[PDB]
Structure formats: C-alpha cells, structure tokens
C-alpha cells in the first residue's frame, strides 16, 4: 500500500494539491500507456485532416466530426463509473478486514496452557504455529505475492511454518480440495489433548480457546469466499464499453475544424484540446481506480502488504507464547496511588 495518512492529517492550503506531484501509486503511472495511445491516435487523425485530405473530403470529415461530437455524452458514463467503483471499493475494504490476525488466540494460549517446563513450552509453540499455518495456506491461495513467496509446500516447510513430520501427515491426508482447514483441526485436537493431560485447567478455558479458533477459521473462510466469487464479468464489460465508446466519440468529435467555414462551436483553431485531455485523465483514472482495487492481493503499488503481515504474525505469536508466558514485570504502585 501507499500510505499518505500522515500527509493529509490537517486541511492546509496544499493538502491535496501536493498529492498531484507524487509518482508511486499515482494516476500517471496507471495512465501513461493509454494516454500515449490516445495522443497518437488524436494527432494522427488531426494531421490527416490538415495535410492529406482534399476539399470535398474535408467537407465530409467536418460533417462526420459534427456527427461524432453530438454523441460525446458524459452523464451516463459518470453514473456507471460511480456505481461500479463504489462496489469495488466496498469489496476492497471488506477483503481487508477478513485477513486473520493471531492475537486473540495468542492472548489465551499464552496464559491458559500451563507448564513452565519444556513440554508446555513446546505445546504452546505448536498451537500458535498451527494457528499461523491455517492463515498462510489461504493467503497463498488468494494472493499472488504470497504464492510467489511460497510456490510449493516445501517452501512453506523451509520457512519454519511446518516441520517435515507435519508435512508427511499433511500429504498423507487425501483430499482433492484446498487443504487450508487441516491445521485448524490439528489445533483443536492438540488443545483437547493438552486439557486431558492436565495443562488446561477447566472446560471453560478450553472452550474459549476453541471459540477463538473458530473465529480465525471464519476469517479464512471469508478470504476464500471473496477470492472465489469475483465481481461479475458482464458488469465490468459494461463500464469498459461505456468509457471506450466515450473516448471513441472524442477522438473524432473533438477535432478542430476549419474556422473559415464558421461552424457553431469551431470558431478557433488551437491545435491541442486541453479540456478533452483533462476529461481523459478524469474518466480513465476513475476507471483505473476500479482496475487497481478489483484484486487487492496482487502486486500493485496499493495492494495489501501481505508478506510483511505473515512475518509479523509469526514473530509476534512465537514471541508472546514463549518469552512472555508468566513473565510479568514487578507489581509496583503507580503514580496515582492514593494511600
């Protein structure tokens, strides 16, 4: 993602005007190629009109230019872009909040699974590693950056997320579907084993741990559902046909005709339409918003930083249930102590 939230905290004079001079993740980086194609086509048509055509051909081209200028209409294009980009942004933020965080399971496994010896330490680390693996196996299915980081399951083993005996048990389980649900079953079986051996005290603490497991499972299921069910293809083809029809009308209708014939609206020849190019930046950039956000797990400048998030979740989890189990600072009186 491109974070600029510290830049737009106050509403000063140059609040949003300073954001037009940025390159990374901007509208220019997304519209360079389309703008150069549009410039090339426009000045090609204009120079063919000025230099090649004969006089009757010029008259027919002027009539065609008036015909095409009658259909350059902005309002329904603005409608369909507004509703489509609203749908895309709603699904974008809805996909962000489905990314699973291990912290709620971390707080309970760090405290409730007892044992300051080796075995309870190993038990807590294995539980949080099973929680992180259940998230990595769905992020490598919904994202291309995580999939380029983990192309095979052996790359998941190399990273330390899965011991080779867990990989042998993982491949021995025979299922033709996506296997992101395997560690979230291993977690619950290990938690019940830990209770039956005497590490978890009562049933209530075990059921709290299992409820947070099911919450993380529902998060992974939401990510799977957003990846598997896209925005419909016809509703994307409608907005592209609309925007490209508007720009095809503006390629011909927005020419500068001959002023000696005095057409209404064509009394001046400027050789370069500034406002047509600004309308191009407006409409084509407001389509590129929806092009960028339709899959936020890719590799754009403003797609989600998911590899960083995997690294954070693994380090924080194994830090909090190993180095922070019953390791508290000394209970002292605070500054607001009355008596």
Chain positions 167 to 196 lying near a copy of itself, rule: CB under 8 A, are 168-169, 173, 175-177, 181-182, 184-193
23 binds, among Ca ion, a copy of itself, none (CB under 5 to 8 A by kind): none
Q: What is the DSSP letter of 231?
A: P
**Does residue 151 touch Ca ion according to CB under 5 A?**
no
Residues within window 266-295 making contact with Ca ion, judged by CB under 5 A: 292, 295
Closest distance of CB 333 from a copy of itself, Å:
7
What's the closest the beta carbon of residue 286 comes to Ca ion, in angstroms? 16
22-to-2, 16, 18, 272, 311 alpha-carbon distances in Å = 11, 11, 8, 25, 29
- 27 or 139: CB nearest a copy of itself: 27
Give CA 320 to chain center in angstroms: 29
Interface with a copy of itself includes 112 (CB under 8 A)?
yes
Stretch that binds Ca ion, among 40-48, 179-187, 298-306, 330-338 (CB under 5 A): 298-306
Among a copy of itself, Ca ion, none, residue 124 binds (CB under 5-8 Å by kind) = none
Nearest to 105 by CA among 206, 196, 198: 206
In the complex, the smallest distance separating the C-beta of residue 70 from a copy of itself, rounded to whole angstroms, is 6
Would you say 103 or 305 has its CB closer to Ca ion?
305
Q: At its nearest, how many Å lie between a copy of itself and the CB of residue 161?
A: 8
Residue 105 CB, shortest distance to a copy of itself, in Å, is 9
Structure-token match 């020849």, residue found: 269
Q: Given phi > 0 = left and psi -120 to 50 = alpha, else beta, which region is 177?
A: beta
* Residue bearing tokens 């930083």: 305
Would you count residue 148 as binding a copy of itself (CB under 8 A)? no
Among 83, 116, 151, 171, interactor with a copy of itself by CB under 8 A: 83
Q: Which two tokens stand for residue 332?
A: 């002292």
Q: Which long-range contacts (CB under 8 A, 24 or more apart) does 189-193 make?
A: 190/123, 190/126, 190/127, 190/130, 191/127
Sequence-separated (6 or more) residues with CB below 8 Å from residue 146: 136, 139, 140, 297, 306, 307, 310
CB closer to a copy of itself out of 103 and 154: 103
Q: Which does 237 bind (CB under 5 to 8 A by kind): Ca ion, a copy of itself, none?
A: a copy of itself
221 C-beta neighbours (distance < 10 Å), count: 15
160: left (phi over 0), alpha (psi -120 to 50) or beta: left
Q: Is 80 a binder of a copy of itself (CB under 8 A)?
A: yes
**Ranges of H-type helices in the chain:** 27-47, 55-69, 75-96, 103-112, 118-142, 145-149, 153-158, 164-172, 183-196, 203-228, 233-253, 274-293, 306-320
> Least Å distance between CB 175 and Ca ion?
30
Question: Which positions from 272 to 311 touch a copy of itself by CB under 8 A, shown as an x/- string?
Answer: ---x--xx-xx--xxxxx-xxxxx-xxxx-xxx-------
With CB cut-offs between 5 and 8 Å by kind, which of Ca ion, a copy of itself, none does residue 154 bind?
none
Contacted by 43, from a copy of itself, Ca ion, none: CB < 5 to 8 Å by type? none
Binding site for Ca ion (CB under 5 A): 292, 295, 298, 300, 303
């Amino acid at each position: 993602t491109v974070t600029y939230t510290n830049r737009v905290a106050d509403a000063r004079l140059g609040t949003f005007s300073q954001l037009l001079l940025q390159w990374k993740g901007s509208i220019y980086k997304l519209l360079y190629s389309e703008f150069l194609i549009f410039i090339s086509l426009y000045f090609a048509i204009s120079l063919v009109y000025r230099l090649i055509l004969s006089e009757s051909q010029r008259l027919m081209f002027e009539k065609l230019a008036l015909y095409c200028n009658s259909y350059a209409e902005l309002i329904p294009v603005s409608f369909v872009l507004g509703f489509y980009v609203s749908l895309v942004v709603s699904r974008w933020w809805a996909q962000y909040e489905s990314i699973p965080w291990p912290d709620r399971i971390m707080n309970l496994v760090s405290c409730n699974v007892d044992g300051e010896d080796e075995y309870g330490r190993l038990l807590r680390r294995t539980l949080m590693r099973y929680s992180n693996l259940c998230s990595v196996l769905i992020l490598r299915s919904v994202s291309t950056a995580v999939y380029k980081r983990f192309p095979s399951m052996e790359h998941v083993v190399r990273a330390g997320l899965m011991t080779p005996e867990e990989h042998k048990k993982f491949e021995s389980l025979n299922s033709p579907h996506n296997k992101f649900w395997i560690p979230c079953v291993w977690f619950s079986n290990l938690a019940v084993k830990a209770r039956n051996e005497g590490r978890i005290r009562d049933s209530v603490l075990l059921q709290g741990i299992l409820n947070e497991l099911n919450t993380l499972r529902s998060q992974c299921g939401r990510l799977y559902g957003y990846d598997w069910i896209s925005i419909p293809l016809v509703y994307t083809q409608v907005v592209t046909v609309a925007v490209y029809s508007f720009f095809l009308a503006c390629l011909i209708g927005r020419q500068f005709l001959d002023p000696e014939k005095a057409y209404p609206g064509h009394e001046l020849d400027l050789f370069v339409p500034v406002f047509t190019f600004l309308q191009f930046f407006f409409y084509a950039g407001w389509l590129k918003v929806a092009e960028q956000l339709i899959n936020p797990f890719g590799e754009d400048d403003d797609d989600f930083e998911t590899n960083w998030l995997i690294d954070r979740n693994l380090q924080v989890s194994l830090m909090a249930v190993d180095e922070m189990h019953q390791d508290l600072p000394i209970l002292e009186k605070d500054l607001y102590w009355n008596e």
